Amino acid sequence: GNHIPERWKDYLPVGQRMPGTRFIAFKVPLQKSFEKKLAPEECFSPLDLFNKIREQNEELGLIIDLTYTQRYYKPEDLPETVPYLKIFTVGHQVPDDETIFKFKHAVNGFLKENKDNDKLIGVHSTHGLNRTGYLICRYLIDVEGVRPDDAIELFNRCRGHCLERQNYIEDLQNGPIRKNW
Numbered sequence: 157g158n159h160i161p162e163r164w165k166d167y168l169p170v171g172q173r174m175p176g177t178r179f180i181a182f183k184v185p186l187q188k189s190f191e192k193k194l195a196p197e198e199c200f201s202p203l204d205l206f207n208k209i210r211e212q213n214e215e216l217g218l219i220i221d222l223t224y225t226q227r228y229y230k231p232e233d234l235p236e237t238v239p240y241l242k243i244f245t246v247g248h249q250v251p252d253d254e255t256i257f258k259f260k261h262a263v264n265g266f267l268k269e270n271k272d273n274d275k276l277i278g279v280h281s282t283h284g285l286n287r288t289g290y291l292i293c294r295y296l297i298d299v300e301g302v303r304p305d306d307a308i309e310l311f312n313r314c315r316g317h318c319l320e321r322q323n324y325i326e327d328l329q330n331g332p333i334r335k336n337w
C-alpha cells in the first residue's frame with residue numbers, strides 16, 4: 157500500500173529559505189492516501205507545504221522532486237501553477253554527474269527566466285536532507301564558488317537538521333568541481 161518512509165516523521169517538514177540563494181528545502185509532502193497511517197500531528201500534505209511557504213513570506217517558482225520510491229503526491233493535484241521537475245536521485249552513491257547537471261540546468265534555467273522574481277526553487281527528497289543537501293550544496297560550490305563547509309553549514313542551518321551522509325559530505329569537501337564546456 158502507501159507506507160510511511162523510514163524516519164519521515166523525525167524531520168521538520170519545511171526548512172528556512174537560504175538567504176543569498178533562491179533555494180528552500182523540505183521533506184516530501186504526502187497525499188491523503190498516506191494520512192490513515194499518520195496521527196494528525198504527524199501529517200504534512202502539499203497544502204501544508206504551501207501554507208508554510210506563504211507563512212514564511214516567500215513563494216515557490218519551481219519544485220524539484222528527487223524521490224523515486226513511491227507515488228508521494230501528483231503534480232497535477234498540487235495547490236498548483238508551480239512548475240514541477242522530477243530528477244530521480246537513486247541509491248546511496250554520490251549522485252552521478254548526469255543528475256548533478258540536470259539539477260544545475262533546471263536551477264540555471266529557472267533563475268534566468270525569473271530574474272525579476274524572488275520566487276524560490278523548492279527542492280525535496282524523502283527527508284529533504286541528504287540527497288537534497290548534496291545537490292543544493294553541490295550547485296552552490298560549483299556555480300557560486302561558495303566553499304564546501306560554508307555551503308553545508310548554510311544548508312544545515314536553514315533546514316533544521318544537519319546533512320548526515322558521510323560520503324556526500326566527503327565529496328562536497330574534497331570531490332572535484334563538475335564542469336562542462
Ligand SMILES: [Cl-]
Pocket residue numbers: 222223224225226281282
Ligand atoms: Cl526516494
